[PDB]
């Protein structure tokens, strides 16, 4: 039954929490068999279909038990393949709806602290990746995305994406990316309302010792600007002269890819039909050496057409002041 199966699983769940050994090897094995028959009901056994009647009766018997909050609260205690199940089962429910409205969204809107338990999971290396799979499934829904982007726990990423484990650092950046992108009309509303602090911490990223972090952030800056929804932020960015001071230097970077990535932010400053004074102060003072640079800058890239067009253009701009 879908009714008893959650009751049979909640007991073995509570049991494992705050314990042992002999009754831990027996108990933690029980949660596993539970989580598989759990996932079995949500993915249609071998009778072809998930029934949608048995799946409906199961779905409700879950927010009522409230075990989901604690299941996340003690993910570290589950086994590898069970942790894999937990996400797999969770990812089903988050998606499922009658058609009109997703009930999982409305349920998590209630039990709120369940979301930030996941963002906290980035500090447990044994749980970090799992948590990623959940949150990026959670960010997909607008009302859940509203909660995290505008949270205080949001500015934790800036050292999560610096975490010593490259895998985890990467996985965090993937969420980080997906938040500031997914709902562009939601994401845009956040950035001008928080410019100073957000870009204060972001500026540190572009100065990173870590090659990937540096690259990916510079690339992510590019996309964020070249966006119809983020127009009010880009203009506010492409005018502060500190921002242009940096990009220019990143063009001198040891790395080809980094430079090229920088160039795409660089061009946006120099294409501005409403340049403000400090930008021109910098561009005019360096006029001579700049035409000198763009002439020589990645000429190997011969078949790039659009890039060379952009280049010949940037020189007319700099030449004509």
């Amino acid at each position: 039954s879908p009714a008893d199966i959650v009751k049979n699983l909640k007991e073995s769940m509570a049991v494992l929490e705050k314990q042992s050994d002999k009754k831990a090897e027996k108990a933690t094995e029980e949660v596993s068999k539970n989580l598989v028959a759990m996932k079995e009901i949500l993915y249609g056994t071998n009778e072809k279909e998930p029934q949608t009647e048995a799946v409906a009766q199961l779905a409700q018997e879950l927010y009522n038990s409230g075990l989901l909050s604690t299941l996340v609260a003690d993910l570290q205690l589950i086994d590898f393949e069970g942790k894999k199940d937990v996400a797999q089962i969770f990812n089903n429910i988050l998606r499922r709806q009658i058609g009109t409205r997703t009930p999982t969204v409305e349920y998590i809107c209630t039990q709120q602290n369940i979301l930030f338990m996941l963002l906290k999971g980035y500090e447990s290396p044994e749980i970090a990746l799992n948590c990623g799979i959940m949150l990026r499934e959670c960010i997909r829904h607008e009302p859940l995305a509203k909660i995290i982007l505008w949270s205080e726990q949001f500015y934790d990423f800036f050292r999560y994406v610096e975490m010593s484990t490259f895998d985890i650092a990467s996985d965090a950046f993937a969420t980080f990316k997906d938040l500031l992108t997914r709902h562009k009309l939601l994401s845009a509303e956040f950035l001008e309302q928080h410019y100073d602090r957000f870009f204060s911490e972001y500026e540190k990223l572009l100065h990173s010792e870590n090659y990937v972090t540096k690259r990916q952030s510079l690339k992510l800056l590019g996309e964020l600007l070249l966006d119809r929804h983020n127009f009010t932020i880009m203009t506010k960015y492409i005018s502060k002269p500190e921002n242009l001071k940096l990009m220019m230097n990143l063009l001198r970077d040891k790395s080809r890819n980094i430079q090229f990535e920088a160039f795409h932010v660089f061009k946006v400053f120099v294409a501005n039909p409403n340049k403000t004074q400090p930008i021109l102060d910098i561009l005019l003072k360096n006029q001579a050496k700049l035409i000198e640079f763009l002439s020589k800058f990645q000429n190997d890239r011969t078949e790039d057409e659009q890039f060379n067009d952009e280049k010949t253009y940037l020189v007319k701009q700099i030449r004509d002041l």
Binding site: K245, M248, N249, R252, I282, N286, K289
Partner: peptide, 5 residues
């Protein structure tokens, strides 16, 4: 080398 200062 760029000149800012």
């Amino acid at each position: 080398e760029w000149s800012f200062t």
